Every structure is written in C-alpha cells, then in structure tokens.
Amino acid sequence: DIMVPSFVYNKLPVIHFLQEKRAEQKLRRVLDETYTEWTEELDQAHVTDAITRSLNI
Amino acid sequence: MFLFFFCDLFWLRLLLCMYYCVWSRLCFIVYFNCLMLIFDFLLFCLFDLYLFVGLCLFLLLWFMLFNLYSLILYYCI
Ligand SMILES: CCCCCCCCCCCCCCCCCC(=O)OC[C@H](COP(=O)([O-])OCC(O)COP(=O)([O-])OC[C@@H](COC(=O)CCCCCCCCCCCCCCCCC)OC(=O)CCCCCCCCCCCCCCCCC)OC(=O)CCCCCCCCCCCCCCCCC
Numbered sequence: 001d002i003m004v005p006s007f008v009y010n011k012l013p014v015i016h017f018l019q020e021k022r023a024e025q026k027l028r029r030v031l032d033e034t035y036t037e038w039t040e041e042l043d044q045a046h047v048t049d050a051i052t053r054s055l056n057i
Numbered sequence: 058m059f060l061f062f063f064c065d066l067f068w069l070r071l072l073l074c075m076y077y078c079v080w081s082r083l084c085f086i087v088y089f090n091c092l093m094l095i096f097d098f099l100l101f102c103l104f105d106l107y108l109f110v111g112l113c114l115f116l117l118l119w120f121m122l123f124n125l126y127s128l129i130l131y132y133c134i
C-alpha cells in the first residue's frame with residue numbers, strides 16, 4: 001500500500017523518457033534506411049543502331 | 058501468562074491510511090546506502106544483495122514512527 005507504489009511512482013519518469021527515446025530511435029532507423037533507387041534502362045541509340053543494321057545499310 | 062496490550066501507533070496508522078490511500082513519490086530516505094551497494098560500473102553480484110531494501114525501509118518507518126514521535130510528552134515507546 002505504501003512502499004512499492006512510491007517506488008513505482010519514482011520509476012515512472014525515467015522509463016517514460018527512455019521509451020520516448022527508443023521510439024525516436026526506431027523512427028530514425030526507419031528514415032535512415034530509405035534510399036532512392038535510380039534504375040538504368042537500355043539506351044535507345046543501340047536499338048536504333050540495330051534497326052539500321054537489320055536494314056542492311 | 059498472557060498479557061493483552063496495544064501499541065501506541067493507532068492514530069499514526071489512521072494517518073497512514075488517510076494520507077497514503079493514493080500514491081506518492083519518495084525521494085528522501087534515512088539509509089540510502091541500501092540501494093546503492095556498487096559504485097564502480099561493470100561490477101555485478103550473483104547474490105541477492107538487494108534483498109535487504111524492503112526490511113530496511115519497513116524498519117526505518119517503524120522505528121521513526123516510534124522514536125521521533127516519542128519526543129512528544131507522554132508518548133510511549
Ligand atoms: C475472556 C475475555 C475475552 C478475551 C479472550 C482472549 C482469549 C485468548 C486465548 C489465549 C491467547 C494466548 C496468547 C495471547 C498473546 C497476546 C499478545 C499480545 O497481546 O500482543 C500485543 C499485540 C499488539 O499488536 P498491535 O501492534 O497493537 O496491533 C494489533 C492490533 O489488533 C491492530 O493491528 P492491525 O490494525 O494491523 O490489524 C489489522 C486491522 C486493520 O485495521 C482495521 O481493520 C481497523 C480496525 C482495527 C480493529 C482491531 C483493533 C482493536 C482495538 C481495541 C478494541 C476495539 C473496540 C472493542 C470493543 C469491545 C467492547 C467490549 O484489522 C483487524 O484488526 C481485523 C479485524 C477487524 C474487525 C472488524 C469487526 C467489524 C464488525 C461489524 C459488525 C456489524 C454488525 C451490524 C449488525 C446490525 C444489526 C441490525 O497483539 C497482537 O499482535 C495480537 C494478539 C492476539 C493474539 C490472539 C488472541 C486470541 C483471539 C482472541 C479473540 C477474542 C474475541 C472475543 C472477544 C469478545 C469481547 C470480550
């Protein structure tokens with residue numbers, strides 16, 4: 001009725017702070033893993049060159 | 058021989074019930090050293106070195122309810 005309640009009440013602030021920091025860390029890790037992937041596609045000049053060769057030019 | 062008597066804490070028990078029906082923080086302790094036995098980090102003990110905390114706190118409360126209030130005249134230890 002007296003002791004354990006008081007010590008729990010004393011614990012609350014530090015635990016709240018640490019859990020907030022942990023959530024911020026999770027969000028930071030989520031953001032840090034985001035990279036924009038620039039894809040590379042076959043240049044159409046080679047396609048045009050192959051078209052010309054097929055014409056026997 | 059069986060003597061029936063009572064302690065002199067009934068009013069203090071009433072006050073404890075009245076003022077501790079709701080939680081309150083404790084930040085000042087008579088014997089704080091029972092909570093901090095290790096001062097150098099990375100040191101740990103496999104023995105239940107923190108078992109004495111509850112008994113320490115209860116003994117402090119009991120002896121303080123008795124002795125400190127005994128200064129009041131006619132209060133009995
Ligand atoms: C022959 C004559 C009679 C006597 C017979 C005796 C037989 C003895 C047999 C042999 C025994 C040998 C060994 C003895 C060793 C003694 C050592 C000793 O004394 O050490 C000191 C030591 C002192 O301790 P303390 O630090 O003062 O704290 C103990 C306190 O009790 C306070 O501690 P606590 O507050 O932490 O306790 C918890 C407390 C938590 O707090 C509370 O609950 C608050 C209340 C506290 C009550 C207890 C305190 C009592 C205060 C004094 C008396 C109050 C008024 C009584 C009025 C009587 C009027 C005549 O809760 C309780 O106490 C639970 C009980 C609550 C009862 C509530 C009842 C409600 C009824 C409502 C009815 C409504 C009806 C409506 C109908 C409507 C119709 C229309 O005593 C003890 O630790 C206890 C010793 C007991 C040993 C066992 C004895 C055997 C049992 C006897 C029972 C007799 C019942 C019949 C009696 C009938 C009337 C005459």
Ligand SMILES: CCCCCCCCCCCCCCCCCC(=O)OC[C@H](COP(=O)([O-])OCC[N+](C)(C)C)OC(=O)CCCCCCCCCCCCCCCCC
Binds near residue numbers: 128
């Ligand atoms: C942490 C430190 C705490 C320090 C507390 C300091 C308190 C200062 C008090 C100043 C004087 C007060 C005078 C009160 C007078 C009352 C009426 C009277 O006649 O008294 C005469 C009595 C006795 O005076 P007397 O000896 O002159 O009586 C003469 C009577 N004849 C002639 C019949 C013998 O006064 C006292 O006993 C006062 C002593 C107080 C000592 C300090 C006690 C502190 C511990 C108890 C704290 C309780 C807090 C509880 C809170 C709730 C807890 C959940």
